[PDB]
Write an enzyme that holds these catalytic residues in place. Structure first.
Site, mmCIF file in Angstrom:
data_model
loop_
_atom_site.group_PDB
_atom_site.id
_atom_site.type_symbol
_atom_site.label_atom_id
_atom_site.label_comp_id
_atom_site.label_asym_id
_atom_site.label_seq_id
_atom_site.Cartn_x
_atom_site.Cartn_y
_atom_site.Cartn_z
ATOM 1 N N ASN A 229 0.824 -1.199 0.000
ATOM 2 C CA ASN A 229 0.000 0.000 0.000
ATOM 3 C C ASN A 229 0.860 1.251 0.000
ATOM 4 O O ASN A 229 0.413 2.319 0.416
ATOM 5 C CB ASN A 229 -0.954 -0.013 1.197
ATOM 6 C CG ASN A 229 -0.225 -0.118 2.518
ATOM 7 O OD1 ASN A 229 0.991 0.001 2.569
ATOM 8 N ND2 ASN A 229 -0.971 -0.367 3.584
ATOM 9 N N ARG B 83 3.504 7.671 10.809
ATOM 10 C CA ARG B 83 2.969 7.272 12.095
ATOM 11 C C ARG B 83 2.773 8.518 12.953
ATOM 12 O O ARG B 83 3.592 9.443 12.926
ATOM 13 C CB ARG B 83 3.903 6.282 12.799
ATOM 14 C CG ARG B 83 3.880 4.855 12.223
ATOM 15 C CD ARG B 83 2.467 4.255 12.283
ATOM 16 N NE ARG B 83 2.399 2.870 11.830
ATOM 17 C CZ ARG B 83 1.930 2.453 10.661
ATOM 18 N NH1 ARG B 83 1.482 3.307 9.737
ATOM 19 N NH2 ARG B 83 1.905 1.142 10.422
ATOM 20 N N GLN C 118 -4.355 4.578 18.161
ATOM 21 C CA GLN C 118 -5.462 4.299 17.263
ATOM 22 C C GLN C 118 -6.308 3.162 17.812
ATOM 23 O O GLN C 118 -5.761 2.146 18.230
ATOM 24 C CB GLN C 118 -4.934 3.922 15.890
ATOM 25 C CG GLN C 118 -4.341 5.134 15.191
ATOM 26 C CD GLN C 118 -3.863 4.876 13.783
ATOM 27 O OE1 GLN C 118 -3.358 5.794 13.135
ATOM 28 N NE2 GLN C 118 -3.966 3.619 13.317
ATOM 29 N N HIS D 277 -7.224 6.593 10.006
ATOM 30 C CA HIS D 277 -6.158 5.832 9.361
ATOM 31 C C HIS D 277 -6.743 4.887 8.329
ATOM 32 O O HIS D 277 -7.097 3.746 8.625
ATOM 33 C CB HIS D 277 -5.347 5.059 10.384
ATOM 34 C CG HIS D 277 -4.159 4.407 9.786
ATOM 35 N ND1 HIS D 277 -3.366 3.543 10.493
ATOM 36 C CD2 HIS D 277 -3.616 4.499 8.550
ATOM 37 C CE1 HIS D 277 -2.381 3.124 9.727
ATOM 38 N NE2 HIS D 277 -2.514 3.680 8.536
HETATM 39 N N1 NAD Z 1 -0.873 5.750 6.334
HETATM 40 C C1 NAD Z 1 -0.769 4.420 5.852
HETATM 41 O O1 NAD Z 1 -1.748 3.750 5.647
HETATM 42 C C2 NAD Z 1 0.599 3.802 5.642
HETATM 43 C C3 NAD Z 1 0.783 2.849 4.674
HETATM 44 C C4 NAD Z 1 2.039 2.283 4.520
HETATM 45 C C5 NAD Z 1 3.092 2.668 5.361
HETATM 46 N N2 NAD Z 1 2.889 3.602 6.335
HETATM 47 C C6 NAD Z 1 3.952 3.954 7.250
HETATM 48 O O2 NAD Z 1 5.109 4.573 6.392
HETATM 49 C C7 NAD Z 1 6.257 4.017 6.802
HETATM 50 C C8 NAD Z 1 7.243 3.972 5.621
HETATM 51 O O3 NAD Z 1 6.809 3.021 4.653
HETATM 52 P P1 NAD Z 1 7.758 2.690 3.449
HETATM 53 O O4 NAD Z 1 7.058 1.646 2.643
HETATM 54 O O5 NAD Z 1 8.206 3.926 2.723
HETATM 55 O O6 NAD Z 1 9.057 2.060 4.205
HETATM 56 P P2 NAD Z 1 10.533 1.886 3.700
HETATM 57 O O7 NAD Z 1 11.213 0.887 4.651
HETATM 58 O O8 NAD Z 1 10.637 1.547 2.271
HETATM 59 O O9 NAD Z 1 11.197 3.323 3.818
HETATM 60 C C9 NAD Z 1 11.404 3.917 5.100
HETATM 61 C C10 NAD Z 1 12.570 4.931 5.001
HETATM 62 O O10 NAD Z 1 12.558 5.618 6.150
HETATM 63 C C11 NAD Z 1 14.075 5.779 6.454
HETATM 64 N N3 NAD Z 1 14.251 6.191 7.826
HETATM 65 C C12 NAD Z 1 14.277 5.425 8.938
HETATM 66 N N4 NAD Z 1 14.530 6.221 9.996
HETATM 67 C C13 NAD Z 1 14.660 7.494 9.527
HETATM 68 C C14 NAD Z 1 14.941 8.678 10.162
HETATM 69 N N5 NAD Z 1 15.136 8.865 11.515
HETATM 70 N N6 NAD Z 1 15.012 9.808 9.463
HETATM 71 C C15 NAD Z 1 14.830 9.747 8.117
HETATM 72 N N7 NAD Z 1 14.566 8.592 7.476
HETATM 73 C C16 NAD Z 1 14.498 7.454 8.193
HETATM 74 C C17 NAD Z 1 14.556 4.587 6.194
HETATM 75 O O11 NAD Z 1 16.041 4.537 6.095
HETATM 76 C C18 NAD Z 1 13.910 4.227 4.819
HETATM 77 O O12 NAD Z 1 14.604 4.663 3.704
HETATM 78 C C19 NAD Z 1 5.896 2.587 7.315
HETATM 79 O O13 NAD Z 1 6.823 2.101 8.190
HETATM 80 C C20 NAD Z 1 4.510 2.903 7.918
HETATM 81 O O14 NAD Z 1 4.756 3.314 9.330
HETATM 82 C C21 NAD Z 1 1.640 4.181 6.489
#
Ligand code: NAD
Ligand code: NAD
Ligand code: CL
Ligand code: CL
Lengths: 361, 361
Positions: B119, B258, B287, B311
């Site tokens: 997603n 988050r 949540q 959410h």
């Molecule tokens: N609102 C929603 O429905 C929804 C859907 C999917 C994911 N998410 C959330 O989004 C987050 C990211 O998803 P993704 O698929 O892009 O993950 P991903 O693992 O592909 O990318 C996450 C990135 O964040 C970086 N990161 C980690 N700590 C960091 C920091 N302190 N500062 C800057 N960058 C940092 C990581 O190095 C990585 O490149 C998920 O973990 C989830 O919490 C929300």
């Protein structure tokens, strides 16, 4: 010269934002220049009714400056009383509030100029925004939060991604094309357009667009339809009950072009019946929209599917400075007697159609 | 095996939409598949309180399936009682509702798997939508229409185009990068990112992105900031009073990552004071968001600047089938004893961090 300038009033909001040039209080920010140039400026929002300030000054106005967001309707009746009128300017884009065909058919020597390109990005952004809001079911989702509720399924049951959807534009000019450009990275299934003017092949290939020859075939295959053509005799009432019956059931329709391209009650009925899942845009007929205009209260079966706003997409603060500058440039072209207007700004030149975008002539 | 599945309830909404796999009524489409394999499936939304259905079954659950939109908080206290737990699955993306550090630091032999990529497009779209809604001041504009009002200036006074703005993402992974890709054709002034994982130069060049290595330098120059990193010890409370004081005054902040990456009350105070012009996103801590959560009622000085939703961005109907199928695949990898998980789905493997995206280890 005597100039009548019809804009919206900002009222209390004028004190909040000095960059709000497009209101009667601030006169496009060109009042110092007009005064120095030696012209008389009548500024008003009072544009309806027989004894409006507009109608009081039409008989000896040399120039009328209008703006689409609060449009002075320059009807045949007003044109016939406008004994000195030589130029109507549109601070914005879209000249359909003037009876262009009457000017043209009678051969009256009135030019109509608008600030082409000044807010086409702004409108294209609003299209993208409205597509996402409708497809992703944002309005009821936000309403749930501010009403202190929480029920994910009540939103998710009618929420989709724009990825994988087939999207069609009616009109592939400045706005329609910029909409297509912005859609490319969202990975639509396909981008389609209907326009009597073909896209340049390089532009077509850049966005992966396919031209569809007739509007019924276009809408029948589209999950999302967006209207980006001017209002003229060929588009007035184009989106009506019969054509809506040929849309894909549950389509989303976006219209930032002009309200009267749609038959208002036919759109409302299609939304209520589920022929459309959603409708949204910023444009209405007439403007200001009356309190009982059907597009205010219409909803789909879930109480949603309505992303209407007042007419403002083209009057963001970023757009306002651009069409204010362009209005000044048009006026200067007239005042100097050079008439060196930018070609693309010319709707009518002394009654003659110069634009090709308002139907074939 | 005994499997506890914690999802949101759809209630009456289940009858409206057959594709709503992610609710307790439809059980990700896997209820009969699990039953035919001899597994016992307990399905519930009751996840809070010491005698919740969740806590009743924690002591002998072999597997717990969660979803971020209605997240079972698998706290250290619950882990300590979960004597048979071997696997936690996330039907969605983001595993922060599980105490991953407790599992890892105390040698709990629990694997944590999520449906990576399922997603990420959906969330990226929601980011783009929220950016546009906030920048273009859509929420009060729609409110005006449904309140039967009409006043263009009341909206235009705080409406901008996204064109020409400087936009920064904190986190440039699957969602963050997809956000940048979608922003390219909107003609931002510049796209910036901050992430301890650098983008490949070719990936940077594709979107014209510039890496900023200091978070304060990043936010100080951004008109729009978007949070796209997981919640872990390095990001919890990252967006606090001191960092917000270094944001560009009047910036817009979007967070679909988050809720707890932001200090909730610090965000609200920055919006009410004007340090931010707007905030929005779909994620909250905790949540379901309590009725009194401050992000519900917070507004800017104009009564707007709030684009919050529940959410749901990652639970659109298009997303749900993807993470339902991916959940089934994870379960099959476990049941067969092959443990042939997709490497990108593995957060913890028997307690050990496999992901690099939840901080350094
Ligand atoms: N609102 C929603 O429905 C929804 C859907 C999917 C994911 N998410 C959330 O989004 C987050 C990211 O998803 P993704 O698929 O892009 O993950 P991903 O693992 O592909 O990318 C996450 C990135 O964040 C970086 N990161 C980690 N700590 C960091 C920091 N302190 N500062 C800057 N960058 C940092 C990581 O190095 C990585 O490149 C998920 O973990 C989830 O919490 C929300
Ligand atoms: N909501 C706003 O604030 C806002 C702002 C700017 C413009 N607009 C409106 O959008 C309209 C389009 O603006 P633009 O800058 O893209 O204009 P444009 O002249 O560049 O493009 C208009 C296109 O519409 C095509 N067209 C005309 N009739 C058509 C028909 N029957 N079917 C299909 N296509 C047809 C034209 O051939 C042309 O390619 C304006 O005329 C204006 O009414 C609204
Ligand atoms: Cl036509
Ligand atoms: Cl970190």
């Amino acid at each position: 010269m005597k100039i009548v300038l019809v804009l919206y009033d900002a009222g209390k909001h004028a004190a909040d934002e000095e960059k709000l040039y497009g209101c009667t209080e601030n006169k496009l920010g060109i009042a110092n220049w007009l005064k120095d140039q030696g012209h008389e400026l009548i500024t008003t929002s009072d544009k309806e009714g027989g004894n409006s300030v507009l109608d009081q000054h039409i008989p000896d106005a040399d120039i009328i400056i209008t703006t689409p967001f609060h449009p002075a309707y320059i009807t045949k009746e007003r044109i016939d009383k406008a004994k000195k009128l030589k130029l109507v300017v549109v601070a914005g884009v879209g000249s359909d509030h003037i009876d262009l065909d009457y000017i043209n058919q009678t051969g009256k020597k009135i030019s109509v100029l608008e600030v082409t390109g000044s807010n086409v990005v702004s409108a294209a952004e609003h299209v993208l925004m409205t597509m996402l809001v409708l497809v992703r079911n944002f309005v009821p989702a936000h309403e749930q939060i501010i009403n202190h509720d929480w029920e994910v399924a009540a939103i998710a049951k009618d929420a989709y991604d724009i990825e994988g959807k087939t999207i069609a534009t009616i009109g592939a000019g400045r706005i329609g094309y910029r909409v297509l450009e912005r859609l490319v990275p969202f990975n639509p299934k396909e981008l389609l357009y209907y326009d009597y003017q073909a896209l340049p092949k390089d532009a077509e290939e850049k966005v992966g667009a396919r031209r569809v020859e007739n509007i019924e075939e276009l809408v029948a295959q589209a999950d999302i339809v967006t209207i980006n053509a001017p209002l003229h005799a060929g588009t007035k009432g184009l989106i009506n009950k019969e054509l809506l019956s040929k849309f894909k059931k549950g389509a989303w329709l976006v219209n930032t072009a002009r309200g009267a391209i749609c038959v208002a009650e036919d759109v409302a009925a299609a939304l209520e019946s589920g022929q459309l899942r959603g409708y949204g845009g910023d444009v209405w007929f007439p403007q200001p929209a009356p309190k009982d205009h059907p597009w205010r209260d219409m909803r789909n079966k879930y109480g949603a599917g309505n992303a209407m706003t007042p007419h403002y997409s083209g009057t963001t603060l970023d757009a306002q400075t651009r069409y204010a500058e362009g209005t000044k440039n048009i006026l200067e072209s007239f005042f100097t007697g050079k008439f060196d207007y930018r070609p693309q700004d010319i709707i009518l030149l002394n009654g003659e159609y110069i634009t090709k975008a308002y139907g074939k002539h």
